[PDB]
Design a protein around this nucleic acid. Sequence first.
RNA 1: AUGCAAAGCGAAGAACCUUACCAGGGCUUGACAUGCCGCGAAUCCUCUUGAAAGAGAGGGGUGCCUUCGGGAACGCGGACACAGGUGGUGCAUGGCUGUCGUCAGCUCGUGCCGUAAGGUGUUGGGUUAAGUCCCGCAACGAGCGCAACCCUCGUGUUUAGUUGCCAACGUUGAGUUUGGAACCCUGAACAGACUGCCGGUGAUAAGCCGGAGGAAGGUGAGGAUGACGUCAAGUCAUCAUGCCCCUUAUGCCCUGGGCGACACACGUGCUACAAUGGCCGGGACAAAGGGUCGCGAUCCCGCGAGGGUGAGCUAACCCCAAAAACCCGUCCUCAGUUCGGAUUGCAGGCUGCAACUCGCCUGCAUGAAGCCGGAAUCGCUAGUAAUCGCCGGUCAGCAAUACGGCGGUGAAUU
Lengths: 217, 99, 92, 99, 154, 127
Amino acid sequence: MGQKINPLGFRLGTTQSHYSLWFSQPKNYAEGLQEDQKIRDCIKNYVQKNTKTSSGVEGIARIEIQKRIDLIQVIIHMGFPKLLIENRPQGVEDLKINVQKELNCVNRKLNIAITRIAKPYGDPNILAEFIAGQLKSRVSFRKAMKKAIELTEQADTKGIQIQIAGRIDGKEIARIEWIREGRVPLQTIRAKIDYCAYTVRTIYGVLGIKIWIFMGE
Amino acid sequence: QKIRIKLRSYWVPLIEDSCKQIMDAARTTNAKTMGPVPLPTKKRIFCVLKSPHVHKDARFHFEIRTHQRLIDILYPTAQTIDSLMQLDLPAGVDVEVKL
Amino acid sequence: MTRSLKKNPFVANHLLRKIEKLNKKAEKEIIVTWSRASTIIPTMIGHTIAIHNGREHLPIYITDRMVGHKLGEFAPTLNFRGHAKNDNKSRR
Amino acid sequence: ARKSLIQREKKRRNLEQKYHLIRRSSKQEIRKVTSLSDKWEIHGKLQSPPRNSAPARLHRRCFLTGRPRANIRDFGLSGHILREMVHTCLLPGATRSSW
Amino acid sequence: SRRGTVEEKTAKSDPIYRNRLVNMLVNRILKHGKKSLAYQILYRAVKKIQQKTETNPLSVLRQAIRGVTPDIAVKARRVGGSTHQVPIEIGSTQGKALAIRWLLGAARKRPGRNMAFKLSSELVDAAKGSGDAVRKKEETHRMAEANRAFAHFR
Amino acid sequence: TVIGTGRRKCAIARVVLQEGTGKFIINYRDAKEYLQGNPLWLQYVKTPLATLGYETNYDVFVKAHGGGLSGQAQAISLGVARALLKVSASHRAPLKQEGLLTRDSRIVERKKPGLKKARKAPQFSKR
RNA sequence: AUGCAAAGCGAAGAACCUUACCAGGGCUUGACAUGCCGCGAAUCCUCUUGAAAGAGAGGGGUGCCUUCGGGAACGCGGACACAGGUGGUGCAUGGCUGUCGUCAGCUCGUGCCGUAAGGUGUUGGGUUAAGUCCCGCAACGAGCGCAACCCUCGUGUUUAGUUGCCAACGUUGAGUUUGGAACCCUGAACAGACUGCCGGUGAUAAGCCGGAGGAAGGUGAGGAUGACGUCAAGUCAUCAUGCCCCUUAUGCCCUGGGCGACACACGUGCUACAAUGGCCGGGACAAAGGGUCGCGAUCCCGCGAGGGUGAGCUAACCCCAAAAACCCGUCCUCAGUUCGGAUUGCAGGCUGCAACUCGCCUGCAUGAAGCCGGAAUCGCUAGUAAUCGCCGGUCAGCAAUACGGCGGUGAAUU
């Protein structure tokens, strides 16, 4: 509704880089966005059947795609690399062919490497899948929001802010919840605040979480 | 003079460090090179409506800065071809080789 | 009045083929038509072409004075002031 | 935006690489006005095959949702979702503008 | 008045004669941003006036506009409920500005020939007592001094 | 030879002063030939030479590109005024008194979205 | 969508398509997804009837693996779950927006005050765009907002020079060639205004008013950025989602029509009522962007739109444009006019199956309303108002009248 500017969209020129950094000619630029969005929808969800399995349990932090000619970088930042890679080398093998069958035309030799994050309570993308995952299991809302505030402060941060929209605990009228601790400078560019947005399933309605994590100045 | 290379990207600290490498690694091979001379940027400006309905005001602005720069080598030697073809360092830059 | 005519006036294949089949020894006048983008060719003389306008097919006569017309300008698109049957008035 | 409407236009894209790939140049020789007085009607009259086929019948549509309006040739997306992609970080060189 | 003080807005002076107050007459007769042709309205009215008069074109300009320049005008101020027609005394800075506005309108409200004759006619008509230019000086004096009781003396 | 830049709006005009007769040559044409049809703004080009008295002693060559005819004329006036500083540093005080060394920062910029002519707001329906 | 925050508003482009609506002709696990079975590779050219959607049959043709049983890719048909919905509800909702507002406020910790709800700090005296700042004061500090940090514009400096420029020097006068990097420009960095300095005012504060030095000062001009929240304001026709409903159906395909229908009303714009203008001829300068199912010069032809041939540019090397006011001379010389173009007839060009309804543009002719317009009412303080040209996005086509973007000329008043 009447909120502040996107801290990932305001800080696009400096500090925080793009989730996809490449170059293409305006003739095959439209096909460049289609191939990068189709794989980002297939790696974030990552389920061939109609079940709630992989990718959403381990928590995806960032997906950086870099390309020049016929080769994509597709480096995924994960919290727990135990689910994506192996249980016996079969997990990353079916992911190597899934991205190959979709993107063809030219000889698309896709290499996918994996890197880790220091702590999952520093990045905004795990927090958007952790707190929103507590809405799926129907746990106490305001107790889960105050726990998401302290779990990031103990992970060494200078400020954190969390807020959703309406349809809380099965209420007919739409309300809003807001808890904040420390300082979060929403206007300044020398703040390097990261953002994420995730949707919830729910049989009564639909929720939408917004994460604001202030690192250094 | 002979071989002309065009370096196109979006962010400035990436190309200026990549084009400076094709000056330091091209002078130690054989002939002299003409320094990284930047030609004018083709900056585009277009608007789009934010709200999915009737709100003609509050229209935004998107910028796509295509920073282009040129660097020319005088004489194409055998040791210059073994350097520039193997030095495939671009992370988001595109190199167009012309004769 | 001058429309989009170059050299090809554009007359449909389902228009002329059905009229050339009737121009063998001259018989039958009533013919149904759906395409209003077609041009009138001088062999349509004496033949009553019923053209569609969305509602129904209106029986219009073709003479020698109407050559460079489209048959669509003959059939009224909507209801304005012209030739039409007097409708039965219900309750006001 | 609907899976029934995007499909109706995908069937209009499949005949573009069948009818308009090679046999379009067969009619393009006589539809235009030639420098000579002898311009044939036979091919312009028998021009019945392109019923559902037409290059002007093609609408770009959004690659994520699929709505016919406000499609930019550079991106290929519509003004609502094109915005959601640049407000995040999904496209290189799509920063904030001033002038 | 206290917060943000601006004196006046001035451009470049008169072409070759050098005067800043006469440069406001070329700026008020200015139609849609054409200062190149607005020069041809004032300087041709200076070339055609030397036959009608004897002295210098700067003198006959100042000796004539004194009959178009007002001393007191009416302003609308409300106090207590009723709108009072209180007359405030006009100075030399606003009085010279009000004189060239009524000489501008009187020139345009006379469709005869060109603007070179229309401005030259209303320049000498202010000295003898004719035209719509000199009539507005005596018309504002009919609104003033009749409502003299609403304003107290200095 | 003495150099001098001098800008106005988007009009740049490089002035190079030298000693000679006194003929002003702008873009391979004379001062009365390029700015033809007797423009009044041609007198402002010769003003920084009039207050010091150098027009009959100094000759000038100037290449003007960009802007309008009235925009180029004020670009020469600043170009000669900055060039009359390098020949003698003592000619700064009587020339800076008129305001010829100072650049006019006035520029007709961008037209803001939502509005027509930058500041002009669209009128809505009255009650 | 409709008080302001509706009314060229969502659709930056509706002749087919788009479209969702209407009429008519048709198909239903069915146009689109997965799974099972049968015949089968899949396709190309198909012929007939028909408005088309479609239906009946014709040859030509059949790759890659296996213990050949069988399969993947794809197709027709069959059975069943389902598929499908721009159907209702945004007073069930996510996301996003307008709005007051860029208004400047909105709060907290500790400590005090009151029984308490709360208050104090966020009051007061001045001062700024601003709880901006100073002083006073049980308030003392802090957080979000304001400011600043980021992007352009205005000065210079350093580095590097092509498709840029070119002073000095040899010129096919066209930088044109060698050559030169000085200057312009170009692209990254760096320096700079911080009321900082002087004086006056003011409570020997803040701040304001002037001045000095300076390209630039008092948030330099102007953007972006617009808090806690107000209107259960807008959008489930962008998408997503709860519920409900339809599911041989408000689902699906096609042809034609419709949305640019009218006695009227209202809003927002454009072109004029002229002669600071029109017209004829000559003629001086711009910035910013576009372009490979593209931008398209030169030449030839046509009164013209445009067409034929066709170079170059994938681009500060080619093209899109030869920018218009302005300016010199001439004509007219204020009569509804050598002002104005609405409308109309006739004849063409161009894009596309195709443009009668519905198009743009050209040529010829016709040539009104209208002489600045009631009550009421709108925007703008500088390079702004006003005005004059150009470019882009959308897009086959609806090219100066919509939106976005660029520059030329250049005020008034406070």
